[PDB]
Scaffold this motif. Structure first.
Motif, PDB file in Angstrom:
ATOM      1  N   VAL A   1       0.825  -1.205   0.000  1.00 57.26           N
ATOM      2  CA  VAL A   1       0.000   0.000   0.000  1.00 57.26           C
ATOM      3  C   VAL A   1       0.859   1.256   0.000  1.00 57.26           C
ATOM      4  CG1 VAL A   1      -1.903   1.176   1.153  1.00 57.26           C
ATOM      5  CG2 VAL A   1      -1.751  -1.322   1.230  1.00 57.26           C
ATOM      6  N   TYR A   2       1.887   1.285   0.852  1.00 54.58           N
ATOM      7  CA  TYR A   2       2.767   2.445   0.924  1.00 54.58           C
ATOM      8  C   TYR A   2       3.570   2.624  -0.357  1.00 54.58           C
ATOM      9  CZ  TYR A   2       1.704   1.384   5.805  1.00 54.58           C
ATOM     10  OH  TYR A   2       1.063   1.087   6.986  1.00 54.58           O
ATOM     11  N   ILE A   5       1.350   4.645  -2.642  1.00 53.71           N
ATOM     12  CA  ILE A   5       1.197   6.045  -2.261  1.00 53.71           C
ATOM     13  C   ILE A   5       2.510   6.797  -2.447  1.00 53.71           C
ATOM     14  CG2 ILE A   5       0.419   7.597  -0.429  1.00 53.71           C
ATOM     15  CD1 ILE A   5      -0.808   4.777   0.737  1.00 53.71           C
ATOM     16  N   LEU A   9       3.144  10.169  -4.803  1.00 50.17           N
ATOM     17  CA  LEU A   9       3.923  11.344  -4.425  1.00 50.17           C
ATOM     18  C   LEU A   9       5.050  11.635  -5.407  1.00 50.17           C
ATOM     19  CD1 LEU A   9       4.160  10.749  -0.565  1.00 50.17           C
ATOM     20  CD2 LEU A   9       2.851  12.540  -1.719  1.00 50.17           C
ATOM     21  N   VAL A  27       7.778  17.546   1.585  1.00 48.71           N
ATOM     22  CA  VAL A  27       7.190  16.425   2.315  1.00 48.71           C
ATOM     23  C   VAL A  27       7.895  15.120   1.975  1.00 48.71           C
ATOM     24  CG1 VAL A  27       5.068  15.099   2.646  1.00 48.71           C
ATOM     25  CG2 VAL A  27       4.976  17.599   2.534  1.00 48.71           C
ATOM     26  N   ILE A  31      10.632  12.640   4.673  1.00 47.35           N
ATOM     27  CA  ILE A  31      10.674  11.212   4.968  1.00 47.35           C
ATOM     28  C   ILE A  31      12.109  10.702   4.980  1.00 47.35           C
ATOM     29  CG2 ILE A  31       9.831   8.948   4.266  1.00 47.35           C
ATOM     30  CD1 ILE A  31       7.605  10.627   2.698  1.00 47.35           C
TER      31      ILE A  31
ATOM     32  N   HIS B 609      -6.322   2.588   4.533  1.00 44.39           N
ATOM     33  CA  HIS B 609      -5.896   2.104   3.224  1.00 44.39           C
ATOM     34  C   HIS B 609      -7.009   2.221   2.193  1.00 44.39           C
ATOM     35  CE1 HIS B 609      -2.280   1.019   5.127  1.00 44.39           C
ATOM     36  NE2 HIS B 609      -2.630  -0.170   5.580  1.00 44.39           N
ATOM     37  N   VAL B 632      -0.914  17.605   1.004  1.00 45.37           N
ATOM     38  CA  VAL B 632      -1.185  17.811   2.427  1.00 45.37           C
ATOM     39  C   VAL B 632      -1.998  16.651   2.993  1.00 45.37           C
ATOM     40  CG1 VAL B 632      -2.551  19.225   4.012  1.00 45.37           C
ATOM     41  CG2 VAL B 632      -0.903  20.306   2.469  1.00 45.37           C
ATOM     42  N   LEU B 634      -1.970  13.470   1.789  1.00 46.90           N
ATOM     43  CA  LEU B 634      -1.023  12.363   1.881  1.00 46.90           C
ATOM     44  C   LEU B 634       0.067  12.614   2.916  1.00 46.90           C
ATOM     45  CD1 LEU B 634      -2.615  11.310  -0.451  1.00 46.90           C
ATOM     46  CD2 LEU B 634      -0.516  11.098  -1.792  1.00 46.90           C
ATOM     47  N   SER B 635       0.262  13.867   3.333  1.00 53.81           N
ATOM     48  CA  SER B 635       1.130  14.146   4.474  1.00 53.81           C
ATOM     49  C   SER B 635       0.608  13.452   5.725  1.00 53.81           C
ATOM     50  CB  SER B 635       1.245  15.655   4.695  1.00 53.81           C
ATOM     51  OG  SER B 635       0.236  16.120   5.575  1.00 53.81           O
ATOM     52  N   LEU B 637      -1.018  10.794   5.848  1.00 52.97           N
ATOM     53  CA  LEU B 637      -0.736   9.366   5.744  1.00 52.97           C
ATOM     54  C   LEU B 637       0.706   9.059   6.126  1.00 52.97           C
ATOM     55  CD1 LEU B 637      -2.235   8.473   2.201  1.00 52.97           C
ATOM     56  CD2 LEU B 637      -3.253   7.861   4.354  1.00 52.97           C
ATOM     57  N   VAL B 638       1.643   9.911   5.709  1.00 51.75           N
ATOM     58  CA  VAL B 638       3.042   9.718   6.077  1.00 51.75           C
ATOM     59  C   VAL B 638       3.255   9.914   7.574  1.00 51.75           C
ATOM     60  CG1 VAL B 638       5.345  10.694   5.823  1.00 51.75           C
ATOM     61  CG2 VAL B 638       3.955  10.231   3.796  1.00 51.75           C
ATOM     62  N   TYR B 641       2.134   6.780   9.475  1.00 48.20           N
ATOM     63  CA  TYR B 641       3.001   5.627   9.271  1.00 48.20           C
ATOM     64  C   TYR B 641       4.433   6.018   8.928  1.00 48.20           C
ATOM     65  CZ  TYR B 641      -1.560   3.382   9.028  1.00 48.20           C
ATOM     66  OH  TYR B 641      -2.836   2.949   9.302  1.00 48.20           O
ATOM     67  N   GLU B 642       5.035   6.926   9.702  1.00 45.70           N
ATOM     68  CA  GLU B 642       6.402   7.341   9.399  1.00 45.70           C
ATOM     69  C   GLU B 642       7.364   6.162   9.473  1.00 45.70           C
ATOM     70  OE1 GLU B 642       7.617  10.619  11.871  1.00 45.70           O
ATOM     71  OE2 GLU B 642       7.284  12.059  10.248  1.00 45.70           O
ATOM     72  N   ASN B 644       6.625   3.093   8.729  1.00 46.34           N
ATOM     73  CA  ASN B 644       6.356   2.199   7.608  1.00 46.34           C
ATOM     74  C   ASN B 644       6.867   2.754   6.284  1.00 46.34           C
ATOM     75  OD1 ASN B 644       3.374   1.762   9.397  1.00 46.34           O
ATOM     76  ND2 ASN B 644       4.911   0.141   9.166  1.00 46.34           N
ATOM     77  N   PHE B 645       6.693   4.056   6.046  1.00 41.22           N
ATOM     78  CA  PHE B 645       7.176   4.650   4.804  1.00 41.22           C
ATOM     79  C   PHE B 645       8.697   4.678   4.726  1.00 41.22           C
ATOM     80  CE2 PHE B 645       2.859   6.459   4.644  1.00 41.22           C
ATOM     81  CZ  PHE B 645       2.554   6.214   3.320  1.00 41.22           C
ATOM     82  N   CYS B 646       9.385   4.658   5.869  1.00 39.38           N
ATOM     83  CA  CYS B 646      10.835   4.497   5.859  1.00 39.38           C
ATOM     84  C   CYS B 646      11.249   3.133   5.322  1.00 39.38           C
ATOM     85  CB  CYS B 646      11.392   4.705   7.266  1.00 39.38           C
ATOM     86  SG  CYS B 646      11.492   6.436   7.773  1.00 39.38           S
ATOM     87  N   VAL B 648       9.643   1.458   2.961  1.00 41.98           N
ATOM     88  CA  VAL B 648       9.483   1.491   1.510  1.00 41.98           C
ATOM     89  C   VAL B 648      10.577   2.336   0.868  1.00 41.98           C
ATOM     90  CG1 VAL B 648       7.911   2.073  -0.368  1.00 41.98           C
ATOM     91  CG2 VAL B 648       7.023   1.091   1.750  1.00 41.98           C
TER      92      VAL B 648
ATOM     93  N   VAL C   5       3.514  21.264   6.509  1.00 43.83           N
ATOM     94  CA  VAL C   5       3.045  22.460   5.820  1.00 43.83           C
ATOM     95  C   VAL C   5       1.525  22.495   5.898  1.00 43.83           C
ATOM     96  CG1 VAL C   5       3.251  23.818   3.696  1.00 43.83           C
ATOM     97  CG2 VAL C   5       5.031  22.160   4.302  1.00 43.83           C
TER      98      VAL C   5
END
Lengths: 34, 653, 363
Positions: A1-2, A5, A9, A27, A31, B609, B632, B634-635, B637-638, B641-642, B644-646, B648, C5
């Motif tokens: 899923v990520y 997304i 982005l 943004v 990350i 999801h 903003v 999708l911000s 969402l990040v 799950y900070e 989790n996105f790390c 990916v 932001v």
């Protein structure tokens, strides 16, 4: 899923309009360093 | 011709979102709020009447002036009269300030004044205390800053220094001098004020002072007028105002109006539907209008808005200045006022009085029904005429404080609420003015009304106010005015234009304010909003969606209610809305919904999801305005799950 | 957290209620200065339409006059004439030069912003009648719109921009309908409505090769789309998407340089491939009406709706301007990769491989 997304982005990161590309880049860079 | 083809063509990419920048307007420094509310806790009535005795300095004429507080002292005998005048004087003051500890001093000694003032200062150390001095029975004040009282036996006039008198009284206090050379007291009071400031190195602005006369001037000796001319003006304005009206040359224009008809005028000072209550209401409007047009805004809110009793005294002081001027007398105030005696509104007061008490022969004798004055009607007519060509920022309308006074009744309330809205529309500069004159606590009080005719007018007025000053969200939650609007937002028959304003008002009350978010959640906003989410109006759909997004902003309880109602599902319909304003507002709410997951149950993750993939199908969109909010969103969402996105991001490196 | 932001969208929306509402908008005011300047522009427009129509009835004389010859920094890729104001945008790979043909001066110089691989293929003038804009579709997909492009007191201003699709890219503006059909390497012709800023219809092309050109018809749905293999499809958007395809006639084998359609009700698709042979088709017929063979190695071509001049190009510096019937009129002796007629005046631009821009005129 990520993965999906994050690919989204990437499209907003490569935007024709500058303001959208700028805010998407901030943004997306906020990350990387975490 | 080939012109109808030109005029009938859509101008693409020429709208508010394109020409203007997508940026919030900078909120101005809203200074309308009152710094503090004063309360006059107690009142000191020092009466040096010396009934039955004449001061040696002034050789009174044989008729002289006998009436004191509308009581002939020589009728009742000396001692009783002095007690009676003190009692009546209390009542008169109780018309203006009924909730204050009164303590009379009747021909007092020096110790008596000391113990009196020191006790009232102990009771209200940090609050204003009124000192009323009536020196008609004692010799005139000296150049050395002294005021005369009696000795225990009433055989000698003892002097009392203004320095010592202003020692015992504290800092927040107000002084009223009704004597002949009263200017001397004010001069010497300011001297001892400066003298204290010089001693402080190695209590001026706080101390208010009113004085019947200038130091050189003497009080009038005219048998027609009461001896207590100044106090009467301050404390019974309408009574002397009518008696003075009947003394001018303009009475020739109305024959058959003597003082005897004025004595027997029907009504009271409270009932605005009576003839006497009408004049009191008009008078309050005229005086409050003169003050607002003549004084600088700073000094107006200091005196006429801080506390009621001071505002009433200065209101009635303006009448004293006019009347006493006509007898070679100039009243004196400590915060010096510019001369109002020549203001145009005074001429209007004459006509208003004239028409009101031209009916008195028929009201008393014939028993005719008192027709109300056209005054307030005609003043609203003047305000309307101003609005017609009022677009430019010219001199503000004189009648603004009258519109406020009209809101207090019901007779002209509908018309005033209309005009007040039309005025606020003109621009944010005007809403600032209407808030500075002090419209807020009256517009807020009308939210207790149930008259449904008011509902479209109050919704309009409140949208304009909250657009300028968003801090009023605090007041609306305190008084439960948010229920008034909730009712309007759940009324199918209310036009969609006024329902749109209601959704904005709610979106402001809720905006970044946990107290308002918790309050509107309990008032069931999300369910009401979803009922109106599929309207045929694109402005309503936009704001209802922003309103929905704000209520669950960092507030999981409003999110859970959305999950039960399944709002996120009903919001996907707005993701394919024609109007790109609505699409953007929809992306906002769906993003704010995701952002406050706060590690809830697994359900939340599957929903997040689902909301992600529904948003993830708004990439190929024409408007970049929407695509910006999409980031903003999708911000959120990040942020959730900070960790989790790390995972990916590190994978594809 | 500072990375968070916040857009000004929710605050900008609230500004709607600060502005007045009850009063009449500025446009409805008949005596407003904007309407008078708009009526003056529409009066000037109707004159330019009338004056140009009168020249057409007098026939078309030989065109050899050169008004000016300047040199650009880059190669002129695509040229367009603003219908009424004399603004001739001549874009380059890394810029968009805005020239003039009355004063004869450089007015502005942009940077499109697109990467080094990309190239500005197509260009239009949105709202040409008044308050005109400049759509600038990049070959990769990026579309973007520029306002205040040749003004004195104003600067470049990009109005909006959005990645389309995803030959290069082709566009056909339709002022009256409000639509815009992007197409290129993909096998799809999208139709982006600009009032709703959403893709309305996704018509399948039904063709392997790239859509090299794309022209439509006003007041009807007749999306013509030339293709790199040679064929020229026609699709009607009124019927179902499967049924949108109407005809598929193939009588060429090369990239279609310019499959242009005329604005008449008698529509004629004049398609000229790299081969250089004209074949005038019709939408209502299965085969060609007329046939012509002009140049062996054609590089770029232009046509004019009002005057039927097929402005050809040549590797050997020639500029053959023939009629649709095939009659000889001129052979102007100098990769001439950009020619451009006015929508009204019989002016013809030309652009050789050398960065030189001309503006011709019919006496």
């Amino acid at each position: 899923v990520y993965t999906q997304i994050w690919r989204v982005l990437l499209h907003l990161a490569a935007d024709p309009y500058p303001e959208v590309s700028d805010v998407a880049m901030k943004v997306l860079n906020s990350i990387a360093y975490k | 011709e080939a012109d109808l083809t030109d005029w009938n063509l859509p101008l693409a990419f020429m709208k508010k979102r394109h020409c203007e920048k997508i940026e919030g307007s900078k909120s101005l420094a809203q200074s309308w709020r009152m710094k503090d509310r004063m309360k006059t806790v107690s009142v000191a009535l020092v009466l040096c009447l010396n009934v039955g005795v004449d001061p040696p300095d002034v050789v009174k004429t044989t008729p002289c002036a006998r009436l004191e507080c509308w009581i002939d002292p020589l009728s009742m005998g000396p001692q009783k009269a002095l007690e009676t005048i003190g009692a009546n004087l209390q009542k008169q003051y109780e018309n203006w300030q009924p909730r204050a500890r009164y303590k009379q001093s009747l021909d007092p000694t020096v110790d008596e004044v000391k113990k009196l003032c020191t006790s009232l200062r102990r009771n209200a150390k940090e609050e204003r205390v009124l000192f009323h001095y009536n020196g008609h029975g004692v010799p005139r004040p000296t150049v050395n800053g002294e005021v005369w009282v009696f000795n225990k036996n009433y055989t000698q006039y003892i002097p009392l220094s203004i320095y010592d008198l202003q020692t015992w009284m504290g800092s927040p206090s107000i002084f009223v001098y009704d004597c002949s050379n009263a200017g001397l007291i004010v001069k010497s009071f300011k001297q001892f004020a400066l003298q204290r400031e010089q001693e402080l190195e190695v209590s001026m602005k706080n101390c208010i002072q009113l004085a019947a006369c200038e130091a050189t001037e003497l009080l009038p000796m005219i048998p027609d007028l009461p001896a207590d001319l100044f106090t009467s003006c301050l404390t019974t304005p309408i009574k002397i105002a009518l008696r003075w009206f009947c003394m001018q040359k303009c009475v020739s224009l109305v024959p058959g109006v003597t003082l005897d008809l004025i004595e027997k005028i029907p009504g009271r000072l409270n009932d605005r539907r009576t003839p006497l209550g009408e004049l009191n209401w008009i008078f309050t409007a005229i005086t409050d209008t003169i003050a607002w047009n003549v004084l600088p805004r700073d000094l107006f809110q200091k005196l006429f808005r801080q506390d009621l009793l001071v505002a009433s005294l200065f209101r009635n002081f303006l009448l004293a200045e006019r009347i006493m001027r006509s007898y070679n007398c100039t009243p004196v105030s400590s915060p010096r006022l510019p001369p109002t005696y020549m203001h145009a509104m005074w001429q209007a007061w004459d006509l208003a009085v004239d028409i009101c008490l031209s009916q008195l022969p028929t009201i008393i004798e014939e028993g005719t029904a008192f027709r109300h004055s056209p005054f307030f009607a005609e003043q609203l007519t003047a305000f309307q005429v101003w609005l017609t060509m009022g677009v430019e920022n010219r001199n503000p309308p004189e009648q603004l404080p009258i519109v406020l006074q009209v809101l207090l009744s019901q007779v002209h309330r509908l018309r005033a609420l209309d005009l007040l809205g039309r005025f606020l529309d003109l621009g944010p500069w005007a809403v600032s003015l209407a808030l500075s004159v002090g419209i807020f606590p009256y517009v807020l009080k009308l939210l207790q009304s149930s008259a449904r005719e008011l509902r479209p007018l109050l919704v309009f007025i409140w949208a304009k106010i909250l657009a300028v000053d968003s801090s009023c969200q605090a007041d609306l939650v305190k008084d439960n005015g948010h229920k008034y609007f909730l009712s309007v937002l759940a009324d199918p028959y209310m036009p969609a234009e006024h329902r749109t304003m209601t959704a904005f008002i709610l979106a402001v009350i809720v905006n970044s304010y946990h107290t308002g978010q918790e309050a509107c959640l309990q008032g069931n906003l999300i369910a009401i909003c979803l009922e109106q989410l599929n309207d045929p109006h694109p402005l309503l759909r936009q704001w209802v969606a922003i309103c929905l997004g704000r209520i669950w902003q960092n507030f999981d309880s409003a999110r859970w209610c959305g999950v039960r109602d399944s709002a996120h599902e009903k919001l996907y319909s707005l993701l394919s809305d024609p109007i790109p304003e609505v699409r953007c507002a929809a992306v906002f709410a769906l993003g704010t919904f995701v952002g406050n997951s706060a590690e809830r149950t697994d359900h939340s993750t599957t929903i997040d999801h689902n909301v992600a993939m529904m948003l993830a199908q708004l990439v190929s969109d024409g408007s970049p305005m929407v695509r910006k909010e999409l980031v903003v969103a999708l911000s959120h969402l990040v942020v959730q799950y900070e960790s989790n996105f790390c995972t990916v991001a590190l994978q594809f490196i | 957290i500072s990375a968070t932001v916040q857009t000004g969208f929710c605050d900008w929306s609230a500004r709607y209620f600060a502005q007045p509402v009850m009063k009449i908008p500025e446009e409805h005011d008949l005596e407003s200065q904007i309407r008078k300047e708009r009526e003056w522009r529409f009066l000037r427009n109707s004159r330019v339409r009338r004056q140009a129509q009168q020249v057409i009835q007098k026939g078309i004389t030989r065109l050899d006059d050169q008004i000016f010859l300047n040199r650009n920094p880059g190669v002129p890729s695509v040229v367009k004439f603003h219908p009424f104001t004399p603004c001739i945008a001549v874009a380059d790979k890394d810029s968009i030069c805005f020239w003039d043909w009355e004063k004869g001066e450089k007015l502005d110089y942009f940077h499109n912003g697109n990467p080094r691989y990309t190239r500005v293929t197509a260009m239009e003038y949105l709202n040409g009648q008044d308050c005109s804009l400049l759509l600038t579709a990049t070959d990769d997909g990026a579309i973007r719109v520029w306002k205040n492009f040749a003004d004195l007191e104003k600067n470049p201003e990009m109005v909006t921009a959005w990645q389309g699709l995803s030959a290069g890219m082709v566009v056909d503006w339709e002022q009256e309908t409000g639509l815009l059909m992007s197409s290129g390497d993909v096998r799809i012709v999208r139709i982006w409505d600009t009032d709703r800023e959403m893709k309305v219809q996704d018509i399948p092309t039904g063709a392997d090769s790239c859509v090299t050109s794309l022209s439509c018809d006003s007041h009807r749905s007749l999306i013509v789309a030339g293709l790199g293999d040679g064929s020229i499809r026609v699709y009607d958007r009124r019927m179902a998407l499967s049924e949108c395809r109407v005809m598929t006639y193939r009588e060429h084998t090369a990239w279609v340089v310019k499959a242009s359609l005329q604005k008449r009700p008698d529509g004629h698709i004049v398609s000229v491939s790299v081969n250089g042979d004209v074949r005038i088709f019709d939408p209502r017929m299965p085969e060609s009406v007329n046939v012509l063979q002009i140049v062996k190695g054609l590089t770029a071509l232009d046509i004019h709706p009002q005057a039927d001049l097929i402005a050809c190009g040549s590797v050997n510096q020639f500029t053959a301007i023939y009629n649709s019937s095939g009659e000889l009129i001129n052979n102007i002796k100098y990769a001439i990769s950009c020619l451009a007629f006015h929508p009204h005046w019989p002016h013809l631009a030309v652009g050789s491989n050398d960065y030189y821009i001309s503006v011709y005129s019919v006496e």
